[PDB]
From Swiss-Prot:
Assembly notes: Interacts with CDC13 and TEN1.
Keywords: Chromosome, Telomere
GO CC annotation: chromosome, telomeric region; CST complex
Any GO MF annotation of the entry: translation elongation factor binding
Outcome following mutation: W154R: Elongated telomeres and severe growth defects
Species per Swiss-Prot/TrEMBL record: Saccharomyces cerevisiae (strain ATCC 204508 / S288c)
Main location: nucleus
Protein name per the record: Protein STN1
Record remark on domains: The C-terminal wHLH region seems to mediate telomere-specific function.
Role summary: Has a role in telomere length regulation and telomere end protection. Acts as an inhibitor of telomerase loading through its interaction with CDC13.
Keyword Hydrolase found: no
Length: 170
């Protein structure tokens, strides 16, 4: 639980179909996350360089936000107002959940998820392999929590696709 994963979840659980970059920043839980990456950026400045901490908070914040946009988890719905579309993230999570639950009802152990298939089922050509793993990683984590009696452990290998590994308890 750190960095853009924490922001990923903040977003994931928002209820809004979208949110403006502006508003998103004013959220308390989001500030805790940037102030954290903020301290790293301060330690990382080159000799002689000295930006204000706020300059670093805002900078950390844009970096945290782009981390998700570059993997396709959130979409920049409107550049003009800096509004993000939170749906790609909510659908990608939902799609994850469904796959995990079916593979389990089938006792699959090891199964593949192709990136192109996910881009096609949902309708987002910008999702990336990293974006897919981070979502399935979180879902597999929650699944083990809600069903200890079913899922013992899990792993995600890579191909352009992820290889999901599942091992059961009873």
């Amino acid at each position: 639980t750190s960095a853009k994963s924490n922001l990923m979840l903040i977003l994931l659980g928002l209820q809004m179909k979208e949110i403006s970059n502006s508003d998103l920043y004013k959220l308390k839980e989001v500030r805790s996350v940037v102030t954290s990456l903020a301290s790293f950026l301060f330690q990382q400045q080159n000799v002689g360089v000295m930006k204000s901490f706020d300059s670093l908070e805002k900078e950390a914040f844009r970096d945290l936000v782009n981390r998700l946009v570059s993997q396709g988890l959130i979409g920049l719905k409107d550049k003009t107002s800096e509004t993000f579309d939170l749906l790609p993230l909510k659908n990608l999570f939902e799609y994850a959940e469904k796959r995990i639950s079916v593979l389990m009802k089938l006792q699959c152990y090891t199964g593949t998820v192709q990136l192109s298939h996910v881009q096609e089922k949902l309708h987002l050509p910008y999702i990336t392999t990293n974006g897919i793993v981070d979502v399935f990683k979180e879902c597999l984590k929650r699944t083990k929590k809600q069903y200890p009696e079913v899922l013992k452990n899990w792993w995600i290998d890579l191909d352009s696709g992820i290889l999901l590994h599942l091992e059961y308890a009873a």
